[PDB]
A paper describes a structure:
Phosphatidylinositol 5-phosphate 4-kinases (PI5P4Ks) reduce the cellular PI5P pool, using this substrate to generate PI(4,5)P2,12 which has also been shown to be required for successful autophagosome-lysosome fusion. Mammals express three isoforms (α, β, and γ) of PI5P4Ks which have differing tissue specificity and subcellular localization. Variation in catalytic site and putative G-loop sequences may account for the large differences in intrinsic in vitro kinase activity between the isoforms (PI5P4Kγ being 2000-fold less active than PI5P4Kα),19,20 although these differences may be attenuated in vivo.
To solve structures of PI5P4Kγ as cocomplexes with examples from this chemical series, a truncated version of human PI5P4Kγ comprising residues His32 to Ala421 was cloned into a bacterial expression vector. A hydrogen bond is formed between the ring sulfur and the side chain of Asn205 and also between the N1 nitrogen and the main chain NH of Met206. The hydrogen atom attached to C2 makes an aromatic hydrogen bond to the backbone carbonyl of Arg 204. The methyl group extending from the 6-position of the thienylpyrimidine ring makes contact with the side chain of Lys216 and also the phenyl ring of Phe207. The methanesulfonylphenyl moiety then runs deep along the back of the binding cavity, forming mainly hydrophobic interactions with residues Lys152, Met203, Ile373, Asp374, and Leu376. The pocket where the sulfone of 15 is located is lined with lipophilic residues: Val154, Phe185, Leu201, Met203, Ile375, and Leu376. The sulfone does not make clear H-bonding interactions in the crystal structure, although a hydrogen bond with the backbone NH of Ile375 is possible. The activation loop formed from residues 377–402 is disordered.
Numbering used by the authors:
A (entry chain A): 45 to 135, 140 to 290, 351 to 376, 403 to 419
B (entry chain B): 45 to 136, 140 to 291, 351 to 380, 404 to 419
The structure:
């Protein structure tokens, strides 16, 4: 795919360009308004695994470099995860070969919304020291191949780098409890919803100590989302039946040995009401 | 200087891009029509050691990569020579690599257009003589772009020494009209002296018949090649190191009254018709008489 090639080329280019820039002791407000653009035009030269004409744009390289550092990701390991071996594809979504990272395509409007809140997000990551249930935004890019702009967003993978997820839920806490379609339920790993969760009498057995840490994190993250006037997010719930930042192991007493994976996902009826109902639903899980 | 920074950035970029491309078993005619262009536009980023806006163009990367190989220069050593340490600035726009193995000369857009028409003829010639020539060794051709100027840069193997300092310098043409270095020129540390200066100083090159035969055979072919391309107005660069690898160096003969190392190459080979046979014969009559 031309896009993945340009994307991998671009990540290698931007990290190498960053390798020359010393990291600043502080991010200035203009670093949130910053971008790096490269336009390649090869005439009769490279026609192999990479197109002759393309553009690549990295948004706020200083901001995302610092966010990576806060999330404990070295710039070199980030590059290796993304480029040493090709990423695998899902249904537009990719996972790094090592399963540590995830690359999601987003729209131009999603990028515009992400810019308005990038400073508020950075300030929040500083305050909670990278310890959050929110997506860890690691890179934001625009790849251009044959009059087609694709906006790519790199995030830490919420699911395991080794353990396979056996059951998947998208929890919202909506008053009208949504259900996965007939078409969805025939897949190997369907994304089940609230009504599916309730109908299956599913419970998460993690123990009061881990639950307290989880609920405190969630409450702040959701309060932060409400302050940004954000709604329609979900709790991604992954269950593994018997390096992982979002993983919580089954309590010693649990009737089933499981590893749960939980994070906030569609963060791009008013916000206050969304949150209370959201938090009421996953507190009862 | 923004230009040197963009140039060094670009050389590092193009060599790394070349490091991914397997070298072809043969150069196709399109490789002589080829180029690599990169346009950078950084907004509210960098601002230290490099410009926010710039363009870099490498002409015929496959042709110049192969020419380097023929001249026995590995792509990695070429990159190190040019970028590990900054090049020193001489006079024109002319730079020398830190290690003194390479030389970078600014040229004009017309010079580049002339160089393209003859790049295939030059490559064919280098193949025939196995990189053993008195001509400049063209290693890279680039166009560096900044806010108010487009600069065409040409990398060549340095004709002078990488260790030994040149004590006397000549630009020999064999011109019917007397060529002499000006008053202003002669007050410099290393003036470029000309034909009349050479003759007035009763200058001689003491090399020995064996080395002279190799030199004159090389020169005759190179000049025949230049004439075939309708080229004239070239010069023989003569460098003399007075005694207390260099490709163009020839040491003094055992019999010589002075121990010296001479450095000789063909240099202003970009001029054409707008007569070459007459130029060549007049020129060769002059340099054989040394
Ligand atoms: C199964 C998995 C999904 C997933 C995921 N999804 C996701 C994150 C953020 C957003 S956004 C840009 O709208 O905030 C949207 C989707 N992110 C990390 N790991 C995993 S694993
Ligand atoms: C003192 C020195 C000059 C010099 C030199 N000059 C030069 C070569 C080629 C041309 S061109 C593009 O018109 O062919 C013009 C000038 N080239 C290599 N080493 C040295 S050392």
């Amino acid at each position: 795919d031309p896009l993945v090639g340009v994307f991998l080329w671009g990540v290698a280019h931007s990290i190498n360009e960053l390798s020359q820039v010393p990291p600043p002791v502080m991010l200035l407000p203009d670093d949130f308004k910053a971008s790096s653009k490269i336009k390649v035009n090869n005439h009769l030269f490279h026609r192999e695994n990479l197109p002759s004409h393309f553009k690549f744009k990295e948004y706020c390289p200083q901001v995302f470099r610092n966010l990576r550092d806060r999330f404990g990701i070295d710039d070199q390991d980030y590059l290796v995860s993304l480029t040493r071996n090709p990423p695998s594809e899902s249904e537009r979504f990719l996972i790094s070969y090592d399963r540590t990272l995830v690359i999601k395509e987003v729209s131009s409007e999603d990028i515009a919304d992400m810019h308005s809140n990038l400073s508020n997000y950075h300030q929040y990551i500083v305050k909670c020291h990278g310890n959050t249930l929110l997506p860890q935004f690691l890179g934001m890019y625009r790849v251009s191949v044959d009059n087609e702009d694709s906006y790519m967003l790199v995030m830490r993978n919420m699911f395991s780098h080794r353990l396979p997820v056996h059951r998947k839920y998208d929890l919202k806490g909506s008053l009208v409890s949504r259900e996965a379609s007939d078409k969805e339920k025939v897949k190997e790993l369907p994304t089940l919803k609230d009504m599916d969760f309730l109908n299956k009498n599913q419970k998460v057995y993690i123990g009061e100590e881990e639950k307290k840490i989880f609920l405190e994190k969630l409450k702040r993250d959701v309060e932060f989302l409400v302050q940004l006037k954000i709604m329609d997010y979900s709790l991604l719930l992954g269950i593994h039946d018997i390096i992982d930042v979002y993983a919580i192991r089954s309590a010693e007493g649990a009737p089933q040995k499981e590893v749960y994976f939980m994070g906030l996902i569609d963060i791009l009826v008013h916000p206050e009401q969304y949150a209370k109902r959201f938090l009421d639903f996953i507190t009862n899980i």
